[PDB]
Symmetry: C2
């Protein structure tokens, strides 16, 4: 059958959906993935044909409203969650006329979209094909979807609705231990780490007696759907050198270049998180995209520095579980960061709990087994 | 598990292994694919981490005669097959030191190689781990493997062996109806077509009023394409030529009616009325999986019997060297486009391929192989 996957405007949205999308291709289905135009090479780099939902990048939709006026990001956590739904929704609303034309020409039997890929359910409603939603992280969307529903009032009105409908199939990669009790019934699916790949360098797979700490931006792209920075690194690397930690830095090339000067004691560049993660004793990141779930699947302790209101509660869940330390706004001092790495490095309780969670992820159903669910869904509709 | 896949020196060897390698990745395994350095981009373009077996192009591993002149490919079918096995084995033996250093560092639990990826079983023997072999087409390697054994005899003796052992698991993507009568039992697996990807353009999924013919090849790859393209363009056919960028601009300039460029076969093939594959490289299995009739113009005695096999089945016409006159090419294209039996047989083979076990199911076989090796 013919399946249209819809990611969104940042690389982790592609990476999160790629295991199921390539598993579907591996089962003999015709599969295409739609994403913003600038995600095109990200899509084709996971081995899939790419379609552009829109030629505008996410920065356009984040910073500008449907009326073409600049919009400020609010700080209140309820407001910011709604704002997140709103900007993903105006991207979808903007993409809908082109995606309708494409879908009428390509004739999908089924549409699979990411959590906030709102063009996916809109297309489903217009065209009468089933919609499956796959989550793309462990982030609660209960405060996000209402922001989307409000912003889509014009599109939903035409369809006789006040809110987007429930998915025909909901697939959730969130480990049950981190899954809120109010989440909708889902077909569980194992998160499988993917990214853009490279020629392997011995250090990505060759350990020494050091202690391997990876500070990472999650994707090499300059703009993910969440803030990242990186000022903290200089002071942190000094702390680490006394620990003869082997410090590895994966960052966008411009940031990567500045860091080579600021912390010369480190190995700075870009490397895929899925390749290097398993080899690490600690991951330090901003708790965006698929980074946290990738770290948990590898059994690695993490320092989570969430930047963005919707990213905070999921990061605290992992710390509360015992597999991470999470430094939320106002907690992330120079000293706090150093002390946290010290403790993650030196107390094996974190590694134990990270491994407990890895084992839980590895018991979840494989993407290949969820392809069966997609086939059953379309057979029942069609 | 950690699984090392070993393709070889041409994109087709990478594409053939990619469904299983990505299926293994999708099952949570750490997967790496090794191939010639110049294939690194192909490996990364299917979504896998790449490692280089060698930086030398495969044609540089054919040795020279007594007096230093490069060795002629002999014409006899048996002789060619044996020569091919020796050539691939020489490549394998040359890459064994680099790959052994890698494998000792990475520690694969299982090694999967394509048919003539002989470094794969050698590595497996050195590291004491299982070896699976996957076919990367429908070519019988019965005449090929003895040449490899002869070439590898010194490496085999270091391991206390006189010949390569059977694979610990043999995986065949050949449709049953096309396998030899004598064929070894294999874990059967569906061929799933895989290519380098690009942004989807409307023409790739939109037909017009014309019959659509795709030609791949695969320098008289040039004389042929131009010659053929001229012909097909005269019958008001929509001609799509899949050529390298190295000749794209020259071909366009000659035959401006043909669409010459960026063509992922997995995307476009199902959309065609006819595929024409010249020289070799491409799997006739992708056309079959798409259910499209094919004109096969093999060059290399190793490619003749399998192309003959698809023709005997009735899904293709195979023009062997000397048979591909302009008239024969033209009559064959007309037949493939118009006759019932060709369309029906190609659809029959597509149905057969579609009933074969999925790559994701073969990953399970790899896991069992690894498990039984060290748990008793």
């Amino acid at each position: 059958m013919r399946i249209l996957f819809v990611a969104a405007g940042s690389p982790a949205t592609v990476f999160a959906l790629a295991p199921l999308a390539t598993a579907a291709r591996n089962a003999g289905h015709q599969v295409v993935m739609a994403a913003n135009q600038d995600m095109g090479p990200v899509v084709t780099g996971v081995g899939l044909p790419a379609v552009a939902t829109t030629d505008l990048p996410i920065r356009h939709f984040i910073t500008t409203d449907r009326e073409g006026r600049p919009e400020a990001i609010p700080s209140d956590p309820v407001a910011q969650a709604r704002f997140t739904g709103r900007w993903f929704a105006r991207m979808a609303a903007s993409s809908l006329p082109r995606m309708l034309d494409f879908s009428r020409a390509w004739r999908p039997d089924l549409i699979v979209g990411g959590t906030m890929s709102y063009v996916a359910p809109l297309l489903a409603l217009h065209l009468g094909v089933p919609h499956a939603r796959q989550t793309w992280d462990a982030v609660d969307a209960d405060g996000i979807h209402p922001g989307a529903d409000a912003e889509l009032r014009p599109e939903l009105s035409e369809l006789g609705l006040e809110r987007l409908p429930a998915p025909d199939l909901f697939i959730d990669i969130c480990p049950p231990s981190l899954r809120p009790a109010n989440a909708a019934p889902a077909r569980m699916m194992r998160h499988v780490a993917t990214s853009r790949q490279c020629p392997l360098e011995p250090w990505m797979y060759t350990r020494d007696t050091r202690q391997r700490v990876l500070v990472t931006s999650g994707s090499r792209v300059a703009k993910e759907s969440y803030d990242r920075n990186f000022d903290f690194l200089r002071g942190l690397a000094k702390d680490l050198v006394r620990w003869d930690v082997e410090l590895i830095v994966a960052a966008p090339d411009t940031v990567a270049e500045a860091l080579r000067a600021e912390v010369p004691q480190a190995r700075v560049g870009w490397t895929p998180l899925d390749v290097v993660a398993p080899t690490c004793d600690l991951l330090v990141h901003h708790a965006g995209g698929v980074s946290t779930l990738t770290g948990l699947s590898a059994g690695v302790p993490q320092l989570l520095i969430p930047k963005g209101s919707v990213l905070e509660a999921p990061a605290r869940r992992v710390a509360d579980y015992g597999a991470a330390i999470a430094l939320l706004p106002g907690e992330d001092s120079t000293e706090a960061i150093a002390d946290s790495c010290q403790e993650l490095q030196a107390k094996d309780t974190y590694a134990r709990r990270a491994q407990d969670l890895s084992r839980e992820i590895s018991g979840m159903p494989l993407p290949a087994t969820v392809v069966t669910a997609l086939e059953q869904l379309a057979h029942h509709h069609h």
